[PDB]
Fold Spike glycoprotein.
Amino acid sequence: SKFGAISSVLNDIFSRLDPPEAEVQIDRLITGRLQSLQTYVTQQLIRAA
Amino acid sequence: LCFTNVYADSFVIRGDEVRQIAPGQTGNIADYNYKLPDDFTGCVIAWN
């Protein structure tokens, strides 16, 4: 999932974009992936209960 | 504001070439003459 980023691949984003907007795109991707992992852990805690 | 330290740089370049004076930019000036750090904080000033 792109999470609204121009792509889901980190290397391509670091490749075709300059730091000023590359940092924002990577921040979007990291926020999305951290949210997905947090959802996974929350669901795992519920199933562990 | 109040600043812990201050440094001022100066130079002469073209008009449209001032576009290259920004953090993390790429170009002749940005890469081979004068490069700002990606986390630079301050102001860039130019005039005719």
Notes: The interface with chain B takes residues 18-20, 23 of chain A (CB under 8 Å). Helices of chain A lie at 10-16, 19-48. Chain A is about 75% helix and 0% strand. The longest helix of chain A spans residues 19-48.
